[PDB]
Amino acid sequence: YTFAKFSTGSMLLTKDIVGKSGVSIKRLPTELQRKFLFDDVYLDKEIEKVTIEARKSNPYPQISESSLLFKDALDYMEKTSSDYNLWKLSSILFDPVSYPYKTDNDQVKMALL
Amino acid sequence: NTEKLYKEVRQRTNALDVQFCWYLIQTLRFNGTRVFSKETSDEATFAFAAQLEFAQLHGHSLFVSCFLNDDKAAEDTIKRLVMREITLLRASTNDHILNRLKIPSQLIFNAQALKDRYEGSEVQNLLDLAEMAIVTSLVQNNELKTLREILNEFVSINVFEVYLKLVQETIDSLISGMKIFYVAACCNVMSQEIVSKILEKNKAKLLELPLQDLMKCTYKI
Amino acid sequence: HNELIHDAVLDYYGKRLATCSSDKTIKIFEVEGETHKLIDTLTGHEGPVWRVDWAHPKFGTILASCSYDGKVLIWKEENGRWSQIAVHAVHSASVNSVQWAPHEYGPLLLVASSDGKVSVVEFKENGTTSPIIIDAHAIGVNSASWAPATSRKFVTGGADNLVKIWKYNSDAQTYVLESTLEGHSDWVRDVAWSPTVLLRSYLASVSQDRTCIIWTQDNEQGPWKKTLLKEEKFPDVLWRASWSLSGNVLALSGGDNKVTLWKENLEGKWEPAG
């Protein structure tokens, strides 16, 4: 016989006759494999990039503006890792380019970009 | 048809992880770069928020949960998590900016009220249960402040009793008796009323007002 | 000595664990990572305590346990001292499951005993019990799980291999059965409603015949959809089946000494995770 249900703090207790209680406080194996996520600095700087407005159907927060770019994550990864390659290439193809020099008309700008 | 392909890519491979897929969808959304269904963006967002919550990263899961389009779901997810996990979400300033996302004043204090009832507050309540709080309280200045808060908000029996204490008398008495009937706190209140009446006394009207506690009543008679 | 605990529950905030074993005692622990310090032992049953279950802290510290002595016992911590405040044994056999409702419903309890009954015990103004019972299953009820909602409902797993979905009705004042589902060849051990307020609703029904059917209803209308999690019998009889709050992960406690985990993918079908 075995028993196991999910915790409020989504994690699992199972029969375990090796502890003291007769159960095991198991930290559920997280699929989330990406180091900088567990460091709270990343999250702070990431909130710095957002504009939160209350909803038009309730007072709960939801994002109105985001300035997140594939670019931004790159500081938190090794330039050698394949991950870094993914995020970089993604930046190159998707993040907006800026062209600082003024251009005669705007279709030109588009061409330069 | 990025989305079309994205959906195709989803069912074929796992090369794109939960986090990446969410980040991608969000960037493209907020930069006009591309278009995704409210539902696909929410799907991605749910998945990542969940992974995060499995990682005991509640602040971060909370932040992600906000990119939900469906207001109903956002409400539920957010609420549920904040109330369940309020303690951890109130440590540093990096946790403060968190609860200064725009977490509703109500939700935050409400959650915090729950955490107090369960660990065995009053300002939050001021901002049934009220009767139980009055029960726990059973000083004069605190009573006056409570009365002021009640007036601002504007149970009735308790109010009458408070008004009498700060200071028709028979009506207040009947109200208090009814409240007592509605256990320890009620008995305490009854004893207090008795003491107050005794202080006031220090003939027919007095007899009307009158009509261990038993021993006291006997000594009185 | 604790060779066989049958159930354990965690509180809303997860600081206080309550295991219950066969020696009839219910031990309360103050958990803290590695160190769960035993804070209490509770002796008041006349048989193995099958299940324990905390209530919503909105109702203070209450814990309804059900044991082999046919009796449901409500407990409560009081100034740091536990006391059996109530009891509800209107069931003529071993009581198996006991699970509180969503706190929006009041302080409702859900008892499910082998006399083919399932009760919903309200606790009135005097704190006294207000039992309104129904007959659930023929040869006995092994489990009964609540449903969240925003029109209340619950599920029951039977000894006649049924899985029933009951709903409240103001006309009847007793929960009226609205839909039954057939798919197991042996005692439906456990049934679970998923807390996912998402597009559809999910039910994981583990059973003795080593199957786990998943009833996914499209919405409020279209009936359920039978889906044998995997199409091979598990090496041994399955016991418990629990959903995760955040995520819709399914945990399966088979009598094969590991707990498996199954997640839904974009096929709609279920895949192991761990």
Side-chain angles (χ1 to χ4, degrees), chain A, chain B residues 1-120 130 133 177 184-185 204 210, chain C:
Chain A
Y1 184 72
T2 311
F3 62 86
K5 280 172 186 167
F6 270 100
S7 167
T8 326
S10 284
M11 64 187 129
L12 228 298
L13 293 185
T14 320
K15 189 186 169 174
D16 186 54
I17 60 184
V18 179
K20 186 264 180 72
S21 172
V23 289
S24 65
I25 305 87
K26 302 282 193 169
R27 184 104 312 144
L28 160 50
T30 319
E31 298 148 279
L32 203 84
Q33 286 174 333
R34 204 169 253 137
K35 280 173 189 154
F36 65 73
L37 280 169
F38 306 139
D39 174 318
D40 301 325
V41 166
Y42 174 90
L43 177 58
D44 216 298
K45 301 183 159 185
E46 200 172 60
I47 312 218
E48 298 202 67
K49 309 252 200 173
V50 208
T51 299
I52 320 299
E53 143 200 312
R55 280 310 89 173
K56 281 146 197 175
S57 62
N58 70 49
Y60 281 86
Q62 266 142 102
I63 286 71
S64 170
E65 300 297 316
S66 140
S67 64
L68 281 327
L69 306 183
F70 296 98
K71 184 189 295 181
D72 304 323
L74 293 166
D75 295 334
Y76 307 101
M77 341 179 103
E78 266 204 320
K79 298 196 177 180
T80 207
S81 50
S82 51
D83 207 12
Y84 182 89
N85 283 339
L86 214 206
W87 285 75
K88 173 77 135 171
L89 174 63
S90 298
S91 183
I92 291 173
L93 300 170
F94 292 109
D95 286 337
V97 192
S98 50
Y99 189 80
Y101 315 130
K102 294 238 145 181
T103 337
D104 287 304
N105 80 39
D106 214 278
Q107 303 161 353
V108 181
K109 191 188 199 175
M110 279 305 119
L112 293 172
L113 292 158
Chain B
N1 45 292
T2 296
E3 175 177 82
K4 179 166 155 278
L5 172 59
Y6 171 70
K7 276 188 176 160
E8 271 153 82
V9 182
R10 234 50 249 284
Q11 308 171 311
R12 289 184 169 172
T13 330
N14 282 302
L16 299 196
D17 61 74
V18 189
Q19 170 180 10
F20 181 91
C21 293
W22 171 82
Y23 199 105
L24 181 148
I25 287 170
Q26 260 29 247
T27 324
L28 304 199
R29 230 181 62 177
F30 287 95
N31 282 119
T33 304
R34 236 75 140 180
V35 277
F36 281 90
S37 332
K38 299 265 197 159
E39 27 279 300
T40 314
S41 163
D42 283 350
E43 190 170 63
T45 312
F46 276 132
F48 182 34
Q51 295 313 330
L52 290 161
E53 206 188 288
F54 287 171
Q56 312 293 114
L57 294 163
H58 301 303
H60 211 306
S61 157
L62 189 43
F63 168 43
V64 174
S65 304
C66 306
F67 295 77
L68 265 44
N69 294 113
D70 177 24
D71 302 334
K72 206 82 176 161
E75 172 163 344
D76 170 45
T77 308
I78 297 262
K79 170 187 305 195
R80 208 179 38 70
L81 170 57
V82 172
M83 302 203 296
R84 177 190 76 194
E85 292 294 331
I86 17 162
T87 301
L88 278 71
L89 296 169
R90 298 243 290 192
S92 342
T93 298
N94 98 283
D95 294 272
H96 216 186
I97 304 157
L98 283 182
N99 288 259
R100 318 137 147 196
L101 262 32
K102 302 283 176 153
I103 303 304
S105 291
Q106 194 65 209
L107 174 60
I108 309 160
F109 100 73
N110 256 10
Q112 184 60 276
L114 189 66
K115 187 77 192 200
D116 302 347
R117 169 111 91 167
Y118 169 88
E119 287 193 354
Chain C
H1 202 68
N2 223 194
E3 300 279 1
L4 181 87
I5 290 161
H6 271 283
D7 197 1
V9 185
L10 273 175
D11 53 319
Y12 198 81
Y13 297 93
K15 235 151 213 280
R16 229 177 302 177
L17 161 73
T19 60
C20 80
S21 75
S22 307
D23 51 35
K24 309 167 191 172
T25 57
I26 300 163
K27 301 172 192 304
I28 272 61
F29 294 76
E30 280 296 340
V31 194
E32 274 177 5
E34 290 275 350
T35 62
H36 18 58
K37 177 202 162 191
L38 180 66
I39 260 215
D40 258 300
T41 306
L42 310 186
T43 292
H45 280 297
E46 294 161 306
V49 191
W50 294 145
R51 283 212 196 177
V52 278
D53 194 36
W54 303 85
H56 197 101
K58 177 185 192 169
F59 316 117
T61 297
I62 293 173
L63 156 56
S65 78
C66 68
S67 173
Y68 182 67
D69 70 311
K71 303 183 188 166
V72 186
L73 270 173
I74 285 78
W75 311 69
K76 160 150 196 159
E77 194 174 54
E78 213 72 88
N79 316 319
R81 302 205 163 193
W82 281 91
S83 42
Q84 299 172 33
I85 285 181
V87 67
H88 185 259
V90 308
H91 297 296
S92 55
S94 172
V95 184
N96 306 285
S97 80
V98 57
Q99 191 197 63
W100 301 96
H103 70 276
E104 295 84 351
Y105 297 170
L108 302 188
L109 191 69
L110 196 66
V111 180
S113 172
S114 315
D115 61 312
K117 285 199 171 176
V118 167
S119 59
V120 182
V121 184
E122 189 144 53
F123 289 75
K124 299 191 195 173
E125 305 196 329
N126 293 20
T128 53
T129 62
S130 180
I132 278 84
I133 310 96
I134 44 161
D135 297 343
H137 283 111
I139 320 182
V141 186
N142 298 163
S143 181
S145 275
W146 271 104
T150 312
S151 37
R152 318 183 167 176
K153 301 179 189 174
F154 58 81
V155 53
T156 53
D160 59 327
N161 313 352
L162 289 177
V163 185
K164 288 183 179 192
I165 302 293
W166 304 74
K167 188 189 184 179
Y168 181 55
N169 221 292
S170 295
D171 294 40
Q173 304 278 36
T174 199
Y175 279 81
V176 182
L177 177 60
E178 193 179 354
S179 271
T180 301
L181 301 169
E182 281 197 40
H184 302 281
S185 66
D186 208 332
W187 282 41
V188 180
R189 280 306 196 179
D190 203 356
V191 285
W193 205 307
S194 185
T196 171
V197 185
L198 186 273
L199 303 187
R200 72 186 63 184
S201 296
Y202 307 84
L203 297 175
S205 60
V206 137
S207 178
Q208 192 98 231
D209 66 318
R210 302 171 243 77
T211 47
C212 174
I213 299 165
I214 300 173
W215 312 95
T216 61
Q217 200 177 26
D218 318 326
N219 62 308
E220 269 202 330
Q221 295 179 7
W224 302 87
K225 297 189 157 170
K226 202 184 197 166
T227 310
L228 295 168
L229 181 75
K230 70 171 180 201
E231 303 194 318
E232 296 131 350
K233 286 161 162 184
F234 295 86
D236 198 52
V237 172
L238 307 182
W239 308 117
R240 292 276 174 77
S242 196
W243 295 105
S244 87
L245 293 155
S246 175
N248 212 59
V249 182
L250 180 58
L252 290 187
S253 301
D256 24 310
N257 290 7
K258 168 68 179 163
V259 192
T260 56
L261 298 159
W262 304 82
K263 49 178 186 188
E264 184 181 45
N265 58 43
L266 285 81
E267 269 281 340
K269 297 153 194 189
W270 300 75
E271 206 164 341

